Nucleic acid binder design. Structure first.
Ligand SMILES: Nc1ncnc2c1ncn2[C@@H]1O[C@H](COP(=O)(O)OP(=O)(O)OP(O)(O)=S)[C@@H](O)[C@H]1O
Ligand SMILES: Nc1ncnc2c1ncn2[C@@H]1O[C@H](COP(=O)(O)OP(=O)(O)OP(O)(O)=S)[C@@H](O)[C@H]1O
Ligand SMILES: Nc1ncnc2c1ncn2[C@@H]1O[C@H](COP(=O)(O)OP(=O)(O)OP(O)(O)=S)[C@@H](O)[C@H]1O
Ligand SMILES: [Mg+2]
Ligand SMILES: [Mg+2]
Ligand SMILES: [Mg+2]
Lengths: 256, 330, 318, 497
DNA sequence: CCCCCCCCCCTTT
DNA sequence: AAGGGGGGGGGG
DNA sequence: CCCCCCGGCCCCCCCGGC
DNA sequence: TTTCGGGGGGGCCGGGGGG
């Protein structure tokens, strides 16, 4: 088996999958000697999910040659639900692969559950996510962003984010009036996790859909803070760090 | 059931329990017996008219194959149960694709009265029959072949149940008279066979009614008079007299004779028409037009009677039709 | 007694494309496709028991070798084939990734596809189009008109014709040799005559004989197999005199147990397919037969009604 | 990774450029012009229509028979103008809920894939836009509830170009798309427009194809290029020469069976040629019954509608047109009785063939010939609906006046209504506005209303038609009548009707 | 720009 | 070989 | 104590010949 | 158009289980 990646507990992989399972259907995983990079595009072709998991997140990682695996997330989640969170989860794939093996092993009861998931043929090529000089680079706690987004979505289906000098406005102008939430760059020493920073280059103003933001903010469980990179005319970048790796959402802004 | 078999109707009390008690179908019985005795039973399609022994034959075959516990080793479905496409997809498929519970053996499925099943279910049954032929066999019973899809008919070996021959009916009547302490005259047996039209149910029901009619069945013999009284059917002499009067007397005399013959025993006009048609079938007419007119007008009168209407007008119509048709002989 | 024996129809089901008789051009085309691969989307149509399912299965087996288990998705009327099934399971199978030799593809076999609803057929279109590089579709049906035009446009039409008497005789003789069956020429003639081009019925009757009487002669065949009643009805309708028609009706149909509804329906069909009689005369006879059929459906299923129908038909043909 | 010789010929030889498309050049040009100028129309809010008239529609509806290049044309147009394609088809659930939760968000959103693919591309302004292609809209079965209406709203309200594709534009289900999209029609391409493509395919695949028999092949597939390419691929496996010798057999084997529509069924059934001896030999009675079954709910209506408008060529010696018409009418009446039997509680659908003979085939054979004029659709459906509406109105009027009269609804129609008119309409034509009160009184005596007044006035026929009479009444009189009625209380016969 | 075949497609709940 | 309307090859 | 999964009615629509 | 019956497919509702 060229590819053998062991997660000490299946909980981590389950949380990672659940983070971006309500917005995409098919994922392409490229596994190389340096780890796993996964890409996904939603049906509407508006949201792009990228995932990076380094070799530090696995107890034992071995990859003789790079491999590509197309997975449907419904089946993957269904199979993952069959393994307890306290078992070690081994992902196994051999040369010329038609399926991937998920092995949930528990040494406490010497119980081994082996599942085989058939791979999907995806012809889409990995979009080149080249570094972009985003105009604004904000970062704020995941809980606060989730609360604000969920509160604003109840009023309007579109949320407008404006970044100006020491001003971050989330307007929700829609059918139910027009509510706004304003936060300022704030720093605390007792609990630095609740600090808000702003590193603009030019003023920014982008409008996004409510459904995409609601799907994106579902990943707050995997990170304590969320980093938002914005540019005058380009997709936003919502980054959630992990113990070893990251989960990024690229959302195409609404027109004007 | 309740109490004992003596409380059952004769049509049910005398239901064959073994293939040796099925009369009048010697070829089919022999073929099926040879098939079972050599382990080469194919899918069966028993096609026949009412009361010929199809259900009895298949039940006896299942009993012979599986013994007394056959009821728990076969899947019997009839028009009284739901047999939709979902039933075929789930219940029949599960039965055909699973092993026996009580004892080892092959699976038998009896789709009695399969002519009452929808076309969709019949189509779904095709691959069920084809795929599980190794361990399952299907038997379907029908009275009307036009209701069965060609695909289903292609998959089944056909056995036709003819109307019961007269000798088989006599043998069954002899067995019944041996069981029930009864005496039957040859004329009574002849009339019973004539009116039965090859149906054993009719024979048994009429015999039971005849026995009930006798005052002292132990020492009273059933005669043709008893049969005609219980069945309320015209006697041959009455039909001959009516026909002779119609064909050889004036209109008033024919009307009077028909009315008197009908009133004497309270006969129905339809039975008289049937008897006269049977009598005239053997007549040798010199002109085809006479037969054509007879058949057409009598069929019209029978159809009119089927919907009710005035009885006297219908009788006069019968008389006039016969007279006009026979006027063409010249 | 409790151990069944495989019927000859299944025991001698052709396992290779070279064992199928009839439709020589189409069979050779299928053999060429198997040899060179690149199977196209196809629809095989015909009438019962001519070798459609056998041909499709043989082609799939020969093409896919040992990859038959994973590369073939078989669905028929006995399986649920609704719109949801087509959208989910068939789409997943088409999107599946499987490693096969250079000239092979995954195969979806929709047997009895005429039973599928219009919505499922509509849903199949873009699935067939987008994934043709890895999946191919083979439909087998009895009535091609049931398949919607868009699906027919995407497939290759293979309309099987009925097996000739020679092909039926050839296959029957091969089976006889492989089974060591005693037979006479007249017995084979009777078997083929009653088969009416249906291989399944021919083999079934051949087994029923021997299984019941040993020697396959015309007599023994006719003691179990009845001559097709459509031919008897045709003889009844074409009889010169009304007396002959009535005699045929009484002896060959009524006294044999055939129901009146069956007789009248067969009369309708035969009159519809009487090419030797003028169309107007056939229309008048059909009107009379329809009157009789309507009377029968009401409950008056008597021999007198059929006799009257024959009398009216003879009146028309005079 | 996919070998060239392992693809279907329809994929290997699929058009790569809009010029490679065969036939329907005008439709392709119309679609290209519509999409090219879509941005300008958006800038003008789709108010100033151009010379072509395509500037007012924000969406296009491509329709035509199968296998002619609609999907290929739409995809090539989308890719030629550097747009990003968002495609949905009948293989995707397209109900109201899913459409609202799906393509609706993308209707006014940018394309992340487009941005990340054309970031380095210069002068690609459309690369970040979406072109929504809704294929197989006609194939929306019960699995897509409300999809047609939601797509119609999308067409009437969208921010990016939207293209819809269907095969049957004349079906009632497609009515909502009547005037909310630019209709682009694709016609069966002729043989001359595809002969070069067939020659190229034959040369590339190493098999002889005679140019003469190409038209016969096109006729066999009825202008389906996909079907003809498939036929060539299937026949070339064993036959290396499609010449005049084998053309007949190939055409007869692959000939299509398209169910005729009601007008075509009526035209063919009434043709006198098929009922001749020879024509009977070619077109048989079974063929006629199958032609009826092609549409068994409209064929009898069409025959009954059009059997009086022909010039028979099958008249028997001495038989006149009127006698044949009478015989056909008698058989149509018998067929109507049979139809009543079929759709009764017994559900005797086994009589469907017999009905076919009594309602369609026999009368047509009696009056078969050449149509004397245009074939007309049945007028029975509209008349039936009108009769049902009038019967409903009569029932309401009867039950409003049921407490004053002594009769059934038929007696009310035949006897009471004339006197009611004489007491409700004539007074207005003699004393003008002085009858108002009197008329109202009459209404109050029978629990009548203004709507009942109009309905009653709408029943009379022949020399008692009130339309002109009502129209000629002075407007002042009618206004006064309405004001007087609306300014007074009236009794109610039935509460909560 | 105009005109003429030549055929196709639509009438239709 | 139904009547009426629309479109693309050829002549003008 | 509250939320989510997925079995069962409930409703609506469309054929029904060879 | 439509007098039953069957079949398919979608929308709710609610029992039960899980956290
Ligand atoms: N060949 C027979 N031999 C003896 N009794 C018979 C025979 N046929 C019918 N009967 C008698 O009539 C009764 C009914 O026979 P069945 O087997 O039910 O006939 P059937 O043909 O299956 O009826 P249908 O086709 O459903 S109306 C039996 O219980 C017997 O008593
Ligand atoms: N051309 C044939 N050659 C040899 N045997 C045949 C042939 N056709 C049919 N049979 C035999 O009959 C049996 C059934 O054949 P099938 O392939 O099932 O016919 P079919 O046309 O597919 O039936 P339908 O259309 O679903 S009713 C086979 O197992 C064969 O034994
Ligand atoms: N005008 C054409 N020219 C060349 N090839 C064509 C043309 N039209 C269809 N084809 C061929 O047929 C194949 C499929 O055609 P499509 O455009 O996808 O079908 P369609 O016209 O959309 O009809 P439906 O409604 O999908 S059946 C193309 O890839 C081509 O290979
Ligand atoms: Mg029975
Ligand atoms: Mg088959
Ligand atoms: Mg298409």
């Amino acid at each position: 088996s060229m590819l053998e990646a062991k997660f000490e507990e299946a909980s981590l992989f389950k949380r990672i999958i659940d983070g971006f399972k309500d917005c995409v259907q098919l994922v392409n995983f490229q596994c190389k000697e340096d780890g796993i990079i996964a890409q996904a595009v939603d049906d509407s072709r508006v949201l792009l999910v990228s995932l990076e998991i380094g070799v530090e997140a696995f107890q034992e990682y071995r990859c003789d040659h790079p491999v590509t695996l197309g997975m449907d997330l419904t089946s993957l989640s269904k199979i993952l639900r069959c393994g307890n969170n306290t078992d070690t989860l081994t992902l196994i794939a051999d040369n010329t692969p038609d399926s991937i093996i998920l092995l949930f092993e528990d040494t406490k009861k010497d119980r081994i559950a082996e599942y085989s998931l058939k791979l999907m043929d995806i012809d889409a090529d990995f979009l080149k996510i080249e570094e972009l000089q985003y105009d604004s680079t904000l970062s704020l706690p995941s809980s606060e962003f989730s609360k604000i987004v969920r509160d604003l979505s109840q009023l309007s289906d579109s949320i407008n984010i404006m970044i100006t000098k020491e001003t971050i406005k989330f307007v929700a102008d829609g059918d139910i009036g027009s509510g706004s939430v304003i936060i300022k760059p704030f720093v605390d020493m007792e609990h630095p996790e609740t600090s808000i920073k702003l590193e603009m280059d030019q003023p920014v103003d982008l409008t996004f859909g409510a459904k995409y933001l609601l799907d994106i903010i579902k990943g707050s469980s995997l990170s304590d803070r969320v980093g938002i990179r914005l540019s005058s005319e380009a997709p936003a970048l919502f980054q959630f760090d992990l113990k070893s790796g990251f989960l990024q959402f690229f959302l195409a802004p609404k027109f004007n | 059931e309740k109490r004992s078999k003596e409380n059952l109707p004769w049509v049910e009390k005398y239901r064959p329990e073994t293939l040796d008690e099925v009369y009048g179908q010697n070829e089919v019985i022999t073929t099926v017996r040879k098939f079972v005795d050599e382990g080469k039973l194919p899918h069966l399609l028993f096609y026949g008219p009412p009361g010929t022994g199809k259900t009895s034959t298949i039940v006896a075959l299942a009993r012979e194959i599986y013994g007394k516990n056959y009821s728990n080793m076969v899947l019997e479905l009839n028009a009284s149960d739901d047999r939709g496409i979902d039933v075929v997809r789930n219940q029949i498929k599960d039965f055909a694709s699973t092993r026996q519970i009580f004892s080892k053996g092959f699976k038998l499925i009896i789709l009695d009265e399969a002519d009452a099943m929808t076309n969709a279910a019949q189509n779904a049954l095709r691959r069920v029959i084809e795929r599980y032929t190794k361990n399952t066999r299907f038997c379907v019973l029908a009275n009307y072949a036009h209701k069965l899809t060609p695909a289903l008919l292609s998959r089944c070996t056909r056995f036709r149940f003819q109307p019961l021959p007269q000798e088989a009916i006599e043998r069954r009547i002899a067995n019944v008279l041996v069981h029930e302490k009864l005496k039957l005259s040859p004329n009574a047996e002849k009339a019973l066979i004539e009116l039965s039209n090859g149906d054993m149910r009719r024979v048994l029901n009429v015999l039971q009614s005849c026995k009930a009619t006798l005052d002292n069945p132990d020492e009273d013999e059933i005669s043709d008079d008893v049969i005609y009284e219980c069945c309320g059917a015209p006697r041959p002499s009455d039909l001959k007299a009516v026909l002779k009067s119609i064909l050889e007397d004036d209109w008033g005399t024919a009307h009077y004779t028909l009315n008197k013959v009908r009133s004497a025993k309270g006969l129905a006009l339809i039975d008289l028409i049937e008897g006269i048609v049977k009598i005239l079938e053997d007549y040798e007419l010199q002109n085809e037009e006479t037969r054509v007119h007879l058949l057409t007008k009598l069929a019209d009168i029978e159809y009119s009677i089927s919907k009710g209407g005035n009885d006297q007008i219908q009788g006069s119509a019968v008389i006039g039709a016969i007279k006009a048709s026979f006027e063409n002989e010249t | 007694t409790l151990s069944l024996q495989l019927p000859w129809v299944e025991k001698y089901r052709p396992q290779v494309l070279s064992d199928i008789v009839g439709n020589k051009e189409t069979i050779d085309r299928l053999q060429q496709i198997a040899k060179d691969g690149n199977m196209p989307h196809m629809i095989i149509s015909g009438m019962p028991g001519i070798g459609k399912t056998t041909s499709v299965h043989c082609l799939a087996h020969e093409l896919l070798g040992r990859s038959y288990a994973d590369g073939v998705l078989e669905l028929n009327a006995s399986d649920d084939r609704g719109i949801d099934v087509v959208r989910n399971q068939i789409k997943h199978f088409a999107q599946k990734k499987l490693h096969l030799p250079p000239g092979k593809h995954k195969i979806v076999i929709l047997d009895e596809a005429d039973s599928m609803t219009a919505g499922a057929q509509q849903a199949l279109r873009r699935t067939m189009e987008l994934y043709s590089n890895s999946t191919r579709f083979a439909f087998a049906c009895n009535q091609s008109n049931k398949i919607i035009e868009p699906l027919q446009s995407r497939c290759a039409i293979l309309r099987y014709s009925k097996l000739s008497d020679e092909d039926v005789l050839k296959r029957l003789l091969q089976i006889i040799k492989l089974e060591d069956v005693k037979y006479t020429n007249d017995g084979l003639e009777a078997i083929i005559f009653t088969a009416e081009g249906d291989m399944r019925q021919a083999i079934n009757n051949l087994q029923s004989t021997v299984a019941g009487h040993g020697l396959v002669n015309a007599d023994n065949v006719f003691k179990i197999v009845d001559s097709p009643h459509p031919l008897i009805v045709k003889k009844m309708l074409l009889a010169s005199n009304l007396e002959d028609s009535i005699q045929i009706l009484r002896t060959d149909l009524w006294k044999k147990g055939y129901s009146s509804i069956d007789i009248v329906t067969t009369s309708f069909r035969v009159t519809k397919n009487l090419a030797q009689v003028k169309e107007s005369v056939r229309l008048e006879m059909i009107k009379e037969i329809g009157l009789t059929h309507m009377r029968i459906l009401e409950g008056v299923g008597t021999y007198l009604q059929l006799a009257s129908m024959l009398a009216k038909i003879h009146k028309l043909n005079n | 990774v996919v070998r060239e010789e392992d693809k279907l010929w329809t994929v290997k030889y699929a058009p790569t450029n809009l010029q490679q498309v065969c036939g329907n050049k005008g439709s392709v040009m119309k679609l290209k012009n519509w999409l090219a100028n879509w941005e300008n129309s958006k800038k003008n809010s789709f108010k100033h229509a151009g010379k072509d008239g395509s500037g007012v529609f924000r969406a296009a509806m491509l329709y035509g028979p199968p296998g002619i290049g609609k999907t290929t044309a739409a995809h090539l147009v989308a890719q030629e103008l550097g747009y990003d394609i968002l495609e949905q088809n009948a293989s995707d659930v397209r109900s109201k809920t899913l459409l609202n939760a799906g393509v609706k968000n993308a209707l006014d959103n940018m394309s992340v894939v487009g941005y990340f693919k054309h970031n380095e591309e210069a002068q690609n302004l459309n690369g970040k836009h979406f072109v929504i292609i809704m294929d197989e809209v006609d194939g929306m079965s019960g699995g897509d509830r409300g999809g047609v209406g939601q797509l119609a709203q999308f067409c009437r309200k969208t921010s990016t170009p939207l293209i819809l594709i269907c095969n049957e534009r004349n079906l009632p289900k497609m009515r909502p798309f009547d005037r909310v999209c630019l209709d682009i029609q694709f016609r069966r391409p002729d043989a001359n427009s595809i002969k070069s493509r067939l020659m190229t395919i034959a040369i590339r695949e190493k098999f002889k194809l005679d140019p003469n028999v190409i038209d016969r092949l096109i006729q066999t597939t009825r202008g389906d290029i996909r079907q003809v390419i498939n036929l060539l691929s299937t026949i070339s496996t064993t036959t290396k020469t499609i010449n005049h010798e084998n053309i007949n057999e190939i055409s007869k084997a692959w000939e299509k069976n398209i169910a005729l529509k009601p007008f075509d069924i009526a035209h063919k059934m009434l043709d006198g040629q098929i009922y001749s001896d020879i024509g009977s030999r070619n077109f048989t009675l079974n063929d006629k019954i199958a032609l009826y079954f092609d549409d068994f709910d409209f064929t009898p209506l069409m025959i009954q509608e059009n059997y009086l408008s022909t010039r028979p060529s099958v008249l028997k010696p001495g038989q006149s047109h009127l006698e044949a018409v009478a015989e056909a009418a008698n058989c149509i009446s018998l067929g109507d009785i049979v139809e009543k039997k079929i759709r009764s509680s017994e559900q005797l659908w086994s009589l469907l063939p017999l009905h076919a003979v009594l309602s369609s085939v026999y009368p047509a054979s009696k009056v078969a010939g050449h149509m004397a004029g245009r074939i007309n659709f049945t007028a029975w459906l509209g008349q039936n609906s009108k009769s049902a509406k009038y019967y409903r109105l009569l029932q309401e009027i009867h039950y409003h006046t049921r407490l004053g009269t002594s009769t059934d609804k038929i007696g009310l129609r035949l006897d009471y209504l004339p006197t009611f008119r004489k007491r409700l309409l004539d007074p207005f034509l003699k004393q003008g506005a002085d009858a108002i009160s009197s008329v109202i009184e009459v209404m109050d005596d029978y629990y009548l209303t203004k709507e009942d007044w109009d309905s009653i006035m709408e029943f009379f026929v022949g020399p008692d038609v009130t339309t002109a009479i009502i129209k000629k009444i002075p407007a002042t009189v009618k206004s006064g009548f309405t004001r007087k009625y609306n300014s007074m209380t009236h009794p109610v016969a039935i509460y909560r009707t």
